[PDB]
Structures are given as C-alpha cells and as structure tokens.
C-alpha cells in the first residue's frame, strides 16, 4: 500500500483541462448572475424608497405602502418558491451540501429561476435575510447545469464543478474570493468521507466570478470600517470571554432557528396559501420595518459600519439586537427564498460592539476601542452557530481588511466553536441537512 | 443515508482531552521555535562579532568569515548524520510521510537533532528557512506528547502530529492561517480521508502564535508598508507573471531534486565527505554574507529592499542566479533547514523584476514594481511545492496588502496551472515519493 | 476635498516661478498627482505627473528641466517650478489630483487654478 | 500621442434638443472621459471611462463611442447645460485632450 502512494504522489495535483476551463465558465455565469440578482435587489428596494416619497405626507398612508410593497414582493417569492421548487425556500446551502454528498437532486431547470427571481421577491422587498443563500445555491446549480449542459463525466466533475459554483456564488456575494474557497473546503465538502473535488479549479471559478464582481461593483466596499486600532497581548483574554459568549448563545439561536422553522410550520400546515399569505405579512412587516427603525429590518450590511465607529448607544444596541433576532427568525425559519449568513455577520457586530462598550469603560488603562471587539464578534455568530471558523475569520478579514485584528479574531472564533461544542450545538447548516434528509426517510 | 443523518448529528466533536493536548503542544512548539530563532539570531551576531574584531586584515575576515560558517554548518551536518539522517533537509516530507503512517517520528532523536543542527546551519546564515526545522520539530513535539501522556487513536495521532506541524509553520512566520492552511492543503494525507480535527489545529496554532507573539511582538519579519493598487485593465499581467512562474516552477523541482543527486556523488554517503562538504557550502554562505549579503542569508532582509524598488535590474538578476545557487547548494545537499523562506525571496526577486519591466513598458498603468514583487513572492511556493491558498495567504498574513488578492491569486494560480501544463509535480511529495521509493528499492 | 493652488502671476520672460497646490480633505499620499494648463481662451495641456513616492514622475514632451514636478507629502503640497518663461507659458495652471475606473487615468478632482502672466 | 479633435467645436440648441458631440481620435483609444468647464469654473470630471456619470451629474447625460470616434449625448438638453466640454484619453502616454466644443443655449 506504500506502493500505491508512490504511485499517487507522482501523480498529485493533476485536473483534466476539461474540467479546469468548465469551471473558468462556471464563475464566469455565477459571477454574472450574481452580479444581476445584486443590481435586481438594489432596483427593487429603490422601487419601494420611491413610492414612500410618492406618499410622503399621510403618515398611515406611507405605513400602508411600506408594507403593501413588501408584502406583494414577499409574496410572490413565497409562490414561486412553494409551486415551482420546495428546495429553493430558506437558505440553500444544505440543499447544496447534499448535492455533494449524492443525496440531494440539483434541480437547476427549476431552482435558478425560482430562486433567483424568489429572491429577487424576498431580498427586494427588504426581508432579513443574506444574498448568500440565493447566491450559493443558484451558484451551484449554474455548476451543475454546465455539468450537464456539456455531459461532462465523472465523479470529479460532478462534485468540482457543484463546488466551484457554490464558492464563486460566496465569493461573489461578498466580494470575498478566499471566503468562497475555504468554505467549501471546510464546511461544504462531504464532511466525513474522502471526496474528489479539485481545489485548483474551485479558484478558477471563484477568480472569475470575483473579476465579474469587480467589474460592475468596482469601487466601493460592501463594508467600509477604516483601519481600526490594534489589540496589546493583555488585551486578549477579554475576546476569550467574548468567545465564550458567543459560544453559550451559539447553539442557542441554533435551537429557535430550528424550533421556529417547526412553530412557523403549524401556522401554515404545509398549505400554500396559509404560507404565501403569512409569506407577505412577514414580508410586509419588514417593509414597514425598514421604515420605522430601519436597523431592525433589511440585509444589516447598513448598520455594520455605524456600530464598529461606536455610534449607537447602548440601549439603541440592546434594541437592535432583540429586533433583529426576531425579524432574523421569522425570515429565515420560515423557510423565505435567502442566506442566514449575512444577518449573522450583522448580529455578531452589534453583540461585539455591546461587549466592547461594556469592555471599554471597565478597562480605560487598555485604551480599548468598541469597534476591535465588533470586528472579533462579527464572525463569531458563524462560528458557534455554523461553525465554520476558518471561514468566518476569512471572511471578515476579506472585508473588513483589519489583519491587525488576527489574533483577537481568532480567538474570539476559536472560542466560540469551543463553547458551542461543550453545550451541545450543532453546525446549523448539517442540522438542516439531517433535519431535511430524516424527513425524507421518516415518510416512507 | 441513515448513516450521515448519525454522521451530521455527529459532526465537530472532538475530545475535550485531544484540544487539551493541542494547547499544550502550541504552547512547546511556539516556546521551543522562539528559542531557535534567538539561537540563529545569537550565532549570526557572535558572527557578526568575530568580523569586527578582524575588520582590517581582508583576507583574514574573509577567512573567519568561512570558517566560522564552516564550522557551525558542519557540526550541523555531523548531528544530522551521526544520530538522525531522517532529520536532514526540510523535514516538511519527513512529517508529510508520517502523516500517512509511513515514517517514524523518532522524537528523542529529531528534536536535538534538528534544533541543534539547524542552530548550526541556519546560524551560521545558510540560504535555509526555519519552517524545515520548526514544522518537523513541531510535529515530532506533538509526538512527544502523544507518547508521553500515551494518548490512543488515529485521531489523536494523526491531529497532534498535525497541530504540532502547524504551530511550527505559524511561528515560522508568526503567521496563524497559513499555518492551519498549510495543513489541510499540503500536509493532511493527499488521497484518503483522515481523522484530523481542525479546531484542535487551531487551539495549537493559537498557542505558538500567542508564544512567538510574546517574545517578538513590536517587529515584523517582513515590512513592505501599504503599496498601491491595481486596475482591473493590469490583471491580465499577472497572469503573464503566473504562467512565468509556472514554466519555472518544475524547472526549479529538477535542480533541487537532481542537485540532490550530484551532489550525493561528492560524499557517496559517506560521514566524512559529507560534513566536510557540509562545512564548505557553510563557509561559502558567511563568506557570501559578507561579500554579497543578499546572495547569502535566509532572504527576509532583502523582501523590504526589493518591494520598494531599491535594485538596479542589473543587481536583481544578479541576486536571482546568485540564489538559485545558493539555494540549492544548501537545501540540495541535505543540510537540515526548509526551501520555504528562500523560495519567497526568490519569488519576490523574480517579481520584482518583472514589475520594473512592466513599469516602463506600460506608463499608462501607473505601475509600481513592488505589486508584481508581493504577487511574485508567494508564486515560486505556487508552481514549485504548490500549495498556492497556503502561498497566497502566507504571503497576505506577511505583507498585509489586502488590496493585492486579485493579482496575488491570478499569478499563484497561473503559476499552479503551467507547473501542471508542464509536468512538475509538488516538491515536498516528490521528495517524499523518492525516500519512500528508495525505502522499498 | 479641495486643491487650492497659488504662486502665480506675474513673471519676467526667460526667468522662472514656483507653484504650490496645497490639498486637503482626502489622504494626500495615496494619489498620484498632475498638473493641466490652459492658455487664455484655449484648451488643456497636461503637464507632469507625480505619484506619492516621487520615485516616477512623468513630464509632457518637454524640454531640459522646462518644468520641475515634485511633492511634500508632510505639507499635503504639490509643487510646479517653470524654468526659461516664453510665453507660451501664459496660462492657468490646475493641479489635478488623479484616479481609475476600469484603470485607464482620468483627472479627478481639479483646483481653481493660479494664473501666470508671463510679461515685462 | 493620440490627437483628438471635438466635433462642433460650437454648437447651439434650444432646451429640449437632443444633443450629441464627437471625439474622433488619431489613433484607437478606448474608455475616454469627458470634462465640463462652466463659465469661469475649473473643469469637473463628467463621464469618465466612456460611459460611465461621475455622482451628481443628471442622468440626461450619456456617453458611447470606440476605436476612432466617441460621443457624449444629452438627451433633452437643458440651459444649465452651457458649458465648453472636452474629451480626454489616457489609453496611451502621454494622455491628452479634445479641442472643446461649446455647447450655447437657444431660447
């Protein structure tokens, strides 16, 4: 058997041009596509800031359409999403884990155009909710279609080229090409058996989806924090207890994230109308949210900023906090067309913030700065609750661009994952996964 | 089915016992890789020293110069030869193999060995790295620990001997991801599925980046400060740098290995002719160190000069051949010390240089060199040990041009893809492919 | 933002002048810099160029040292020093700060200009 | 270096008109920008990377061309539109800029 690794090692490394070019094209569409369902998003809120200002005097009137809006967008992405493909509600990036692993269908003549423009519904009427999901799903499924499309063989183009488009549509929601990479190659990936996904055509992908990101997205950062300051060595243990934080209330959203999928469920019963219906009310709510406290509705890309620079008050935090936990829930859980991810970023700075508020008054010889345990706290959400560490940390980093922060990063991650382990949380996107493929046994 | 709904259930838990022991193992590999920076520090200053007390007489100084650096490089050569052979080289192929249970981890041996061996080398401002000895090192720790608290399973055998390699990485660079990407990228065993817990990675990497952070903090091994940017209109000429690379990259895997080669003929094995030659490369390099310090040394010191297009074009090709040489003459030849650290200077140097050519034929760009430098510099560790994400981000962790991940990504990756299209194969696997081979042959 | 330049007016012909643009409300480092003039009545004309480093500075085909680029990073400054004054040398003179979309140059933000009278 | 010369290099409509002006250039230049210079104002960069608004300016101004020759349109002219509008490319060194062509207004 030592002989067969000579013989593998010698032959390491090695990815059938086919395959290599097929993902070059994969990131390409992706990329496009993403870029498209961005630029629809942003049209369609503009839309809805327009019409506001069409009925800008009659208070309830403005509260009325605010909601309307919403609600008829909301709606309508809750219908495409129940008639056409069940798979393409909620996040999407199970339904793609799956795939990977053989036990999920990637239903692309289907998904794309339902979870596209049944995004283009959700995250255009305001809702809490990522572009991620819609993007990395729709990412994968464009990888398959290509599969397909071109009949390319093999167990190496089936889970590459689904790979690769499922990071170039992360890499292409945030901008962040390392991001989507160490995504699939931590979180993504079969997770338990050896598997035959090329990584150096996985970069081509990502590369290609990121240049048409750049192309139309060109100056201007999704996230702009300016350079914040450092953190000195005794600093540290304060973003070990942040981590522990994170790492009790880790598992514990985990709970009603999935409790709330359930107790939105029975509202419902599984009845397209009691769902399209509660779809648009939601979705009106959040219209009319992102009216009366803006903060509490919408992506939460809006409010990053605004809390690293230590602009909000205390109890504006505690609000926007309990607020969006709330409005994160009733979107997400009920099973709307749109990533967790992003409002998780948002949860994990405003949490941050809170802590580095706190931590700067108790200790004024540290010369601390709220917004370094922001920036710690912003990926440490996705790190108790997804439990993708390496991916949250390079995410932020990618975006936020304060490598300074490495350490405090880190360990506030690193912390996190330890805490959600010893109390007994699941990766909430594996817990998606074994919840959706037992309900398929379980009805037999 | 039924079994990955018990799998997802199931997933990232890891023995409260093996994290415990990753903590641990961090915590000895950052200490002892700290130490062994401050040895090679001390010795290149005692050095320093000898050729200040003979500063007048030329001839004399360049004397003391080699047989300083004669003398420390073959009392690394001897303990390499005499009580660890497995321990000479790199040691990254070393730890690669015993990842895939096929080589042993003779700690006892390896650790005073290598430590005090590579003292030897590196001290004595040999044209190595210090990732060779601290990632073998810090393997072999994480062994020692497994041994001693006789931890059982594949798990904690295979996680501690990984933590243990990465911590070692990391405080090479004081670079954290590229130390936990290093492993599950390179070092994880290449073609079956393996039980290495990446949580307890980390916790080791924390530990011996929080270690080296706590004696070296204040002081960057590279300062490169915040370079420009690059237009989408400039990508393209990375590419171009990339695929140079990549035609490079396995050209530099023939020498080093083939180097290995001819320069086995000069001893045959033999103890003698070995650490006598070993001591005459050594004295080659502190006499170089002193002649033309950026031919010799480890390479750090001239990254800054470079990036800021401090070299003549005439001065960059010379230190180009210049290292090609000394570089293989170092590593070829078995001394204990890794390829990593000369092959980032070397791919600065080449980048570099192909930055000033782009300058002047390209004034519409606005260039500045030093992009196509810290796009160049983690390329040669793309198309010659290819591992471009550890590449990429080693060199981010280090230079902090974030500005720079496009080009810095599109050149690693033009470099991975023609050391493919031109039949190279990953230097530490093909090394790994020889001593496995030339085990059962 | 603004680039606010001044030095100018009047100058013997054959003798010569220095120009100072000082800027303030953007990093002023991090911007390669230029200078554009324009003769009463007509166009534009680029001059020079300078990065934040001063290690490239590009002129116009012009002569010996016709005209001297140069910048205090520490004074936020942009520096133009016209030698051998003719009077094609007549003009308003805009320092120009300089930026990219897709990457080909374009002149940013300009200054109100200082006029120069070359003149006996 | 790339000589570009301005269509009209004076031209009149009345508020309403559709508008178009002309950089036709010496040799191929690609993503040119085009400057307007108000009455005794500097010039302020208007559409750059041929095409594309600089922020602030109407969306009643628009851009096309390539190779040779490029425009700038306005599509309903309005009065506040009088200015003189020159073109410039940096596609190859050294840069350079149009003869201007001076919108004027009739009303």
């Known amino acids: 058997r030592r002989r067969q690794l000579i013989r593998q090692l010698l032959e390491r490394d090695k990815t059938p041009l086919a395959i290599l070019f097929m993902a070059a094209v994969v990131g390409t569409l992706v990329g496009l596509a993403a870029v498209a369902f961005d630029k629809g998003v942003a049209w369609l809120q503009n839309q809805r800031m327009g019409a506001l200002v069409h009925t800008a005097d009659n208070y309830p009137l403005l509260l009325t359409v605010a909601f309307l809006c919403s609600a008829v967008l909301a709606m309508f992405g809750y219908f495409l999403v129940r008639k056409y493909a069940p798979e393409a509600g909620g996040s999407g990036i199970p339904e793609i884990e799956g795939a990977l692993e053989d036990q999920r269908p990637v239903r692309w003549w289907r998904v794309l155009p339902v979870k596209f423009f049944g995004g283009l519904g959700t995250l255009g009427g305001g809702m809490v909710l990522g572009r991620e999901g819609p993007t990395v799903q729709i990412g994968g499924n464009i990888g398959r279609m290509v599969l397909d499309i071109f009949r390319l063989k093999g167990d190496e183009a089936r889970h590459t080229l689904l790979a690769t488009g499922a990071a170039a549509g992360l890499a292409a929601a945030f901008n962040a090409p390392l991001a989507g990479i160490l995504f699939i190659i931590e979180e993504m990936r079969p997770q338990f058996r050896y598997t035959l996904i090329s990584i150096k055509a996985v970069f081509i992908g990502v590369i290609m989806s990121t240049i048409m990101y750049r192309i139309f997205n060109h100056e201007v950062a999704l996230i702009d924090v300016g350079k914040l300051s450092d953190a000195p060595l005794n600093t540290l243990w304060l973003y070990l207890i942040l981590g522990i934080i994170f790492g009790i209330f880790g598992p514990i959203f985990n709970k009603w994230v999935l409790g709330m999928q359930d107790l939105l469920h029975r509202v419902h019963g599984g009845n397209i109308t009691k769902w399209v219906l509660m779809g648009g009310a939601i979705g009106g709510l959040c219209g009319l949210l992102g009216f009366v406290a803006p903060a509490t509705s919408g992506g939460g890309f809006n409010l990053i900023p605004i809390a690293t620079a230590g602009n909000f008050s205390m109890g504006m935090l505690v609000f926007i906090f309990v607020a969006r936990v709330i409005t994160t829930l009733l979107c997400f859980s009920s099973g709307a067309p749109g990533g967790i991810f992003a409002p998780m970023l948002a949860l994990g700075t405003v949490l941050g913030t809170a802590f580095g508020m706190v931590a700067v008054e108790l200790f004024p010889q540290y010369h601390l700065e709220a917004g370094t345990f922001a920036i710690a706290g912003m990926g440490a959400l996705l790190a108790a609750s997804i439990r993708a560490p390496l991916t949250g940390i390079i995410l932020v980093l990618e975006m936020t661009d304060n490598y300074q922060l490495i350490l405090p990063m880190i360990i506030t991650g690193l912390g996190a994952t330890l805490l959600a382990q010893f109390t007994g949380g699941k990766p909430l996107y594996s817990a998606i996964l074994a919840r959706t493929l037992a309900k398929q046994e379980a009805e037999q | 089915r039924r079994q990955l709904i018990r799998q997802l259930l199931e997933r990232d838990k890891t023995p409260l016992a093996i994290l415990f022991m990753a903590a641990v193992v961090g915590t000895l590999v950052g200490l002892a890789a700290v130490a062994f920076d401050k040895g090679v520090a001390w010795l290149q200053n005692q050095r320093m020293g000898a050729l200040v007390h003979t500063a007048d007489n030329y001839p004399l100084l360049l004397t003391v110069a080699f047989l300083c650096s004669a003398v420390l490089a073959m009392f690394g050569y001897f303990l390499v030869r005499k009580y660890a052979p497995e321990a000479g080289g790199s040691g990254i192929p070393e730890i690669e193999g015993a990842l895939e249970d096929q080589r042993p981890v003779r700690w006892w041996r390896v650790l005073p060995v290598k430590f005090f061996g590579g003292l030897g080398t590196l001290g004595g401002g040999m044209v190595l790295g210090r990732e060779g000895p601290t990632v073998q090192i810090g393997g072999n720790i994480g062994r020692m620990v497994l041994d001693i608290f006789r931890l059982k399973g594949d798990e904690a055998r295979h996680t501690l001997l990984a933590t243990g390699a990465a911590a070692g990485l990391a405080a090479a660079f004081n670079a954290p991801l590229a130390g936990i990407l290093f492993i599950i990228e390179e070092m994880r065993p290449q073609f079956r599925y393996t039980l290495i817990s990446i949580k307890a990675v980390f916790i080791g990497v924390i530990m011996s980046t929080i270690m080296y952070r706590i004696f070296n903090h204040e002081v960057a091994l590279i300062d490169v400060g915040k370079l420009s940017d690059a237009p989408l209109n400039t990508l393209w000429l990375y590419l171009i740098l990339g695929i140079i690379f990549g035609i490079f990259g396995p050209i530099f895997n023939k020498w080093v290995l083939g180097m290995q080669d001819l320069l086995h003929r000069v001893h045959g094995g033999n103890i003698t002719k070995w650490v006598l030659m070993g001591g005459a490369i050594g004295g080659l390099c502190g006499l170089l160190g002193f002649v033309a310090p950026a031919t010799s040394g480890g390479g750090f010191n001239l990254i800054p000069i470079a990036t800021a297009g401090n070299f003549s074009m005439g001065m960059l090709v010379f230190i180009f051949v210049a290292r090609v040489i000394t570089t293989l003459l170092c590593f070829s030849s078995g001394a204990p010390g890794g390829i990593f650290a000369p092959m980032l200077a070397l791919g600065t140097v080449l980048g570099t240089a192909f930055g000033m050519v782009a300058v002047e034929l390209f004034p519409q760009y606005h260039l500045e060199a030093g992009t196509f430098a810290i796009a160049g510099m983690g390329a040669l560790l793309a198309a010659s040990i290819r591992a471009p994400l550890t590449g990429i981000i080693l060199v981010l962790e280090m230079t902090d041009n974030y500005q720079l991940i496009l080009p810095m990504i599109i050149t690693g990756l033009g470099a991975t893809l023609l050391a493919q299209f031109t039949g190279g194969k990953p230097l530490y696997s093909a090394i790994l492919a020889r001593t496995l081979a030339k085990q059962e042959a | 933002v603004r680039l606010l330049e001044s030095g100018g007016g009047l100058v013997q012909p054959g003798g010569s002048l220095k120009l100072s643009c000082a800027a303030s409300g953007f990093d002023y480092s991090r911007y390669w810099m230029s200078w554009v003039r324009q003769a009463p009545g007509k166009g534009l004309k680029w001059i020079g160029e300078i990065n934040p480093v001063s290690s490239t500075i590009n002129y116009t085909p012009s002569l010996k040292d016709k005209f001297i680029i140069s910048r205090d990073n520490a004074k936020d400054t942009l520096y133009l020093q016209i030698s051998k004054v003719r009077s094609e040398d007549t003009a308003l003179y805009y320092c120009?700060?300089?930026?990219?979309?897709?990457?080909?140059?374009?002149?940013?933000?300009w200054g109100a200009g200082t006029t120069v009278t070359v003149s006996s | 270096d790339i000589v570009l010369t301005q269509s009209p290099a004076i031209m009149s409509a009345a508020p309403g008109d559709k508008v178009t002006m002309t950089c036709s250039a010496s040799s191929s230049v690609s993503y040119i920008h085009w400057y307007q210079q108000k009455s005794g104002t500097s010039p302020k960069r208007w559409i750059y990377?041929?095409?594309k608004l600089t922020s602030g300016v109407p969306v009643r101004f628009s851009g096309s061309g390539s190779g040779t020759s490029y425009s700038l349109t306005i599509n309903t002219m309005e009065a506040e539109d009088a200015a003189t509008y020159y073109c410039?490319?940096?596609?190859?060194?050294?840069?350079?800029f149009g003869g201007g062509t001076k919108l004027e207004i009739l009303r």
């Open positions: 990377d041929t095409s």
């Open positions: 410039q490319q940096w596609s190859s060194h050294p840069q350079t």
């Open positions: 120009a700060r300089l930026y990219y979309g897709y990457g080909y140059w374009y002149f940013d933000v």
